[PDB]
Design an enzyme around this catalytic site. Structure first.
Site, PDB file in Angstrom:
ATOM      1  N   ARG C  54    -172.903 -93.523  20.633  1.00  0.00           N
ATOM      2  CA  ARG C  54    -172.173 -92.262  20.626  1.00  0.00           C
ATOM      3  C   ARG C  54    -172.134 -91.655  19.224  1.00  0.00           C
ATOM      4  NH1 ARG C  54    -168.204 -94.279  22.231  1.00  0.00           N
ATOM      5  NH2 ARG C  54    -168.851 -94.462  24.431  1.00  0.00           N
ATOM      6  N   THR C  55    -171.817 -92.475  18.228  1.00  0.00           N
ATOM      7  CA  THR C  55    -171.696 -91.952  16.863  1.00  0.00           C
ATOM      8  C   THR C  55    -173.071 -91.581  16.323  1.00  0.00           C
ATOM      9  OG1 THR C  55    -169.663 -93.161  16.372  1.00  0.00           O
ATOM     10  CG2 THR C  55    -170.974 -92.422  14.476  1.00  0.00           C
ATOM     11  N   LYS C  84    -180.671-110.349   6.314  1.00  0.00           N
ATOM     12  CA  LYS C  84    -180.268-111.729   6.647  1.00  0.00           C
ATOM     13  C   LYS C  84    -180.846-112.693   5.597  1.00  0.00           C
ATOM     14  CE  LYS C  84    -183.520-113.802  10.033  1.00  0.00           C
ATOM     15  NZ  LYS C  84    -183.716-114.114  11.479  1.00  0.00           N
ATOM     16  N   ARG C 105    -173.783 -97.061   9.217  1.00  0.00           N
ATOM     17  CA  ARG C 105    -172.654 -97.768   9.835  1.00  0.00           C
ATOM     18  C   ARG C 105    -172.939 -99.260   9.705  1.00  0.00           C
ATOM     19  NH1 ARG C 105    -168.971 -96.047  14.270  1.00  0.00           N
ATOM     20  NH2 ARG C 105    -168.338 -97.897  15.502  1.00  0.00           N
ATOM     21  N   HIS C 134    -163.668 -94.652   8.642  1.00  0.00           N
ATOM     22  CA  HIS C 134    -164.572 -93.947   9.550  1.00  0.00           C
ATOM     23  C   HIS C 134    -164.318 -92.467   9.331  1.00  0.00           C
ATOM     24  CE1 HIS C 134    -167.171 -92.940  12.723  1.00  0.00           C
ATOM     25  NE2 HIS C 134    -166.593 -93.528  13.753  1.00  0.00           N
TER      26      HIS C 134
END
Ligand SMILES: Nc1ccn([C@H]2C[C@H](O)[C@@H](COP(=O)(O)OP(=O)(O)OP(=O)(O)O)O2)c(=O)n1
Ligand SMILES: Nc1ccn([C@H]2C[C@H](O)[C@@H](COP(=O)(O)OP(=O)(O)OP(=O)(O)O)O2)c(=O)n1
Ligand SMILES: [Zn+2]
Ligand SMILES: [Zn+2]
Lengths: 144, 310, 310, 310, 144, 310
Positions: C54-55, C84, C105, C134
């Site tokens: 959605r974002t 990683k 994000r 946010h």
């Protein structure tokens, strides 16, 4: 300067002084402590030295200094004046202070003390982990 | 039209010295004078059968900087209908009816070459095929050397790390061997030595190379210090620790380095280049990565335009 | 140039009342008068180290509505070479040589802030960092309140649901506390109460707030009813059922609601807003979501253009 | 009590030649005269932190052949999503209050040794710890060589394959080096040579060994041909292709083998030993596996039963 | 034994000199150093003391001791004379030395130095991480 | 027959004080005089629908210590791709035709109780059902308190940690509340307080309890310090950091502990109990785990064997 009793280790190389205090918990006591660092002695890089009050170290305690400060001298004090000079020999076990360089060794993140075995070579020294049984140059072990 | 128009870009072994120079000259021109509409109305397939975020973002950015549109996929352990059943041949036969060029990365050697046999008149650009080729990495490497050194001949180039399994260093060595008077210094543990076939190739061209066990032996003379990751995945952890120190680079090691000397690394660089190198004027691995954009732009432009007014 | 030109957008705590008003005024202008070519030839990285469909769609749509190109990734449980292992620092050092702005994000708090330390002159926009900030959700929330209420001061704002763990409500409360005369109503089970540090912040500014156990207690006076999901994942299923009814909203509850009152919800809204609310004139959570486009456009425009002729 | 009563069995380097001989003699006895109730009322933990079906079944079969009960598990599944945040130390501290002995296999080197520091008076038997030890494999190997050759002294032993990374050949070499007059032939590609420290150990003991490029060079004088799996996951597939032939055995290779020669392999042999070898009198890998039962019984019996076996 | 030119940190809370040496890497120099822990302390009950020659501490560096020796006394010395004494005051920001207690903070295993905003509270000091923006009691941060 | 012969063991609330005392007395007897053939020829199902290695090994060891045979499984893997579309009812209906008793652990509350409705004359022993019951844990806890304290009456019992979500402390509290004169100290952060219904149960019984912020407040008067794991997956990591110190124990915390005090913990203790506690005479968590065997034997013996143990 001088202390009545306890111990004074001298002829520690430059920049090895603080590492001994670090590794060997050499200052972890409510008893009195006086240390001298980057001290003038003779050579250009000179010397560090330590003094400890009311505490004595065993013959085995001396030997752990070998890997970092081979040329030292530990000194017992009983009244004001010294008693005996001491010299660290290569021990047969270096415990607690070293870290196994093998990242898959069980010793990491487990409630055990590190333990290695010593033996000489041309250009380096082999150290052998009690646990993984792998053998490394001290120059590998001493960089982690 | 230009020598690379509508050509496939598969292997460094297929590119001549002149081809290399043409890509590099074009890259310098687009770097100085961007042409954000050159590939307007072109659609390019970004086909990463094998995922590689860094390479894919670099390539897709290059596409957008020339105004092209982009469609594609990055594939993990999967596929829709009907690869893992459908041949690569059929996949390319389909995709080549859609797009104006195909950029592809794949886990099997030869995949890009096979693609050219099914893509009709759609050019294929190899973004890496197994342990075989990765020619646009080599182009960006070469662009970076040329830009920082002013030349690609008569250089002292050290390569350090896993020379046995690095397709990137094999390719760069082949490429540099197309120019004159280069001298190589290989610094690797015996288990990861530069392969004999590379050494034979240099011998046949009378190109000087030597082995050294430490960076210190070559630092005073090196122009390019090209560091490559250690594929420790193939190695015992104990083994990886015993020969770590031989390819670790830190800022203190650069004390007697030439003013012109650059440190390159195709990345990622953990455990090889200490972060303290980053601030020195020799650290050039991020600039190298940024140069990927201009090298990849030049390639797309040359391949998709007959003549470039730059 | 405008106060937000080339600024990083990381935390609501770094944005002044004037900054907030500037973003909102710009959003209203682009909503009324779109500028589909403003960011022509800009390339923006959509970096979702943590996936959020959605974002991400909202942000990428905003980019395209201003004419920018977009490259990026959304990451599940993975990464190619060599995160990683490769630091976030190196990833940003690379990507910032490619693109004109980075939207990111990430699952760890502080990730966007760390990114600014490695992105050089490339602005970083925080699309969410762990339980920390946010800010573009808060901007779209604020834009929606201002647009529907005509102001951001002297409002009655109720917040209902999981107030303890909702970064979105913490941020909105901080933002609204930069304006004057706002009054807050907190409706949450004791286990999920608005945190004391938020309450202290309101106390220090002389801002009135009170606790209520039911929406009915405040409905007649509320201007904005901001509903937030229950993070039931942290809770026993039995516990989640015992206090479900306290944050469920249905159409019947809106009987004595003011004509101006809007229901907001950052979404998804299962189990909190009955579908029967959707048809009432107070339901404004979809309109809120649509407002994300204009808030995010304004932010990109302000950050990437010196002066906006609107 | 017998020399091994209540001792931990962790590493071949902790077992003297007399210990080895005692295990083998005990194994011979149990093979000849089974004692199905010797360990009645003992409960043994079969702890496969790393899964290994072949080794586990062998060990659990040996437990039941002496009448012991078995509890256990097999992980390899628990890894890094949490695996077990609990220390191995704590796991052992708990399990050693339940059982009379612990048989354990673990992916980390040293794990069994660590276990002994937390197991109290409960003996630990090492079923394999990373690339370190696997003494029960060496014990069944030795038992198999002694049975088929009549001795463990003055033998011609060839080892073939991945000599670099095989814990099993490292351990067998150390073990055979405790006896007298043994001569070794090491057949391995350069990338997979017997490690220097093994060769150095042999040198101190004045034990003869030689390197050979292929099996045919020594086939006519070997008593034991001990083959190992080539961990092909380490090599490049093309590299594997090119050296493959030197470490693969087929029946026609056996023409000039001594009548007494046996081919051993700790298994799986999928690549290295052709199936046409299977019906030669030299194939002894399945008989080898079968002897795992008697070697593993002998060890359990000796460690758990005060009085020596008759 | 006394000093001609440099810095003397006095009234150091006992057993803390060593720590101060660790955290601030004070032994990472060539200048002559003199240390005493739990010493002959007329002017205290149990205190530590550190001397460093030819080196001087700015106001902020002195303030960085506030959390570890808030009643220390830092002496600036030249030509054998003590030219200035200062007490640590609470800094507004503390960098490098502390570790963020939030296990999910980006700061762990990334090439950045820790950084905290400092603000005094009744009964403790609040420390707010630059990265994760979470605020902790200094007792929580200092714990590890 | 004995009071528990052929009874289901599902919930602590179904066991009287006389039942509890009978299990403990039976456990004491078996510890002192083992009966390795008591359940010879019984077959018991070890049904771990939810995996739990520590609890399963304990239970299966207890079965073998009485000479019973064991069949079983461990899932947690089967989940929602289908898990098992078959009802638990049917699984039990089938399995109860095979075995003499069912020991089962399941992720859903009520599962064991449901089992009894389908198991016919086959007893069901609950090894844990969701956040509901875990009576054999409570039985080994009680046995451990009775053994080390000489009684289950008039004790000072501190419980520390996640009192909100720990089924184990809820159950131990209910159990101890069946005896007389016990006083409780509850040490937990507010987000993790002992639930109201437990406190209400204590109030009806006129049992004393108090809340304490830390262990030192009561360390000098406690007989049992029962620590629990903090399910940190529930809390925010920063929240966990801030309350951590109140529920962690180290050796220096024990200076003023009574000589008779024991520290219990159902394990794992990875975070809450420092390893320096381990060698104090107060550490009793491993001895606690060891008593699981005798409590679990007693229960199996009582339920499967008509005549009481001698
Ligand atoms: N109460 C006391 C008494 C003596 N010392 C120590 C400090 C000096 O290190 C040591 C001096 O005696 P040495 O034997 O060590 O002097 P050397 O003879 O070793 O000096 P050199 O090696 O140069 O000959 O006495 C001390 O610290 N405290
Ligand atoms: N050339 C000097 C002068 C002073 N000092 C040290 C000794 C003291 O520990 C500290 C302070 O010097 P002062 O002369 O000020 O001693 P004070 O007794 O005055 O310290 P205070 O003010 O705490 O009483 O510095 C030193 O090492 N070398
Ligand atoms: Zn090790
Ligand atoms: Zn932080």
């Amino acid at each position: 300067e001088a202390i009545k009793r306890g111990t004074v280790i001298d002829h520690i190389p430059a920049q090895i002084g603080f590492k001994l205090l670090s590794l060997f918990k050499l200052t972890e006591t409510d008893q009195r402590i006086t240390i001298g660092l980057n001290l003038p002695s003779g050579e250009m890089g000179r010397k560090d030295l330590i003094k400890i009050e009311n505490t004595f170290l065993s013959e085995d305690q001396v030997d752990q200094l070998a890997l970092y400060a081979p040329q030292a001298t530990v000194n017992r004090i009983d009244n004001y004046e010294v008693v005996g000079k001491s010299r660290p020999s290569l021990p047969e076990r270096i415990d607690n202070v070293l870290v196994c360089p093998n990242s898959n060794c069980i010793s990491h993140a487990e409630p055990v003390s590190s333990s290695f075995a010593v033996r000489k070579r041309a250009n380096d020294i082999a150290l052998k982990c009690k646990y993984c049984e792998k053998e490394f140059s001290h120059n590998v072990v001493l960089a982690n | 039209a230009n020598p690379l128009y509508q050509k496939h870009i598969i292997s460094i072994n297929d590119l001549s010295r002149d081809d290399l120079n043409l890509v590099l000259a074009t890259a310098a021109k687009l770097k100085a004078n961007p042409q954000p509409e050159l590939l307007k109305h072109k659609v390019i397939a970004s086909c990463f059968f094998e995922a590689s975020t860094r390479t894919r973002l670099s390539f897709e950015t290059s596409m957008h900087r020339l105004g092209a549109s982009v469609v594609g996929f990055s594939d993990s352990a999967n596929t829709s209908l009907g690869k893992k059943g459908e041949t690569l041949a059929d996949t390319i036969s389909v995709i080549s009816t859609y797009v104006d060029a195909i950029v592809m990365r794949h886990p099997q050697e030869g995949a890009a070459r096979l693609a050219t046999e099914f893509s009709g008149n759609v050019p294929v650009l190899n973004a890496g095929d197994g342990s075989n080729q990765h020619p646009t990495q080599t182009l960006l490497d070469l662009f970076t050397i040329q830009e920082t050194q002013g030349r690609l001949d008569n250089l002292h180039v050290a390569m350090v790390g896993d020379l046995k399994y690095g397709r990137t260093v094999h390719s760069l060595t082949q490429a540099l061997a197309k120019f004159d008077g280069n001298r190589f210094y290989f610094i690797a543990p015996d288990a990861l030595a530069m392969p004999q076939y590379i050494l034979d190739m240099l011998d046949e061209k009378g190109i000087a190379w030597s082995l050294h066990s430490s960076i210190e032996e070559v630092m005073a003379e090196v122009d390019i210090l090209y560091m490559t990751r250690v594929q420790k995945e193939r190695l015992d952890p104990s083994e990886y620790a015993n020969v770590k120190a031989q390819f670790v680079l830190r800022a203190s090691d650069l004390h007697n380095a030439k003013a012109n000397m650059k440190v390159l690394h195709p990345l990622p660089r953990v455990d090889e280049i200490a972060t303290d190198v980053d601030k020195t004027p020799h650290a050039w691995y991020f600039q190298q990565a940024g140069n990927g954009i201009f090298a990849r732009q030049a390639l797309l432009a040359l391949v998709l335009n007959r003549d470039l007014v730059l």
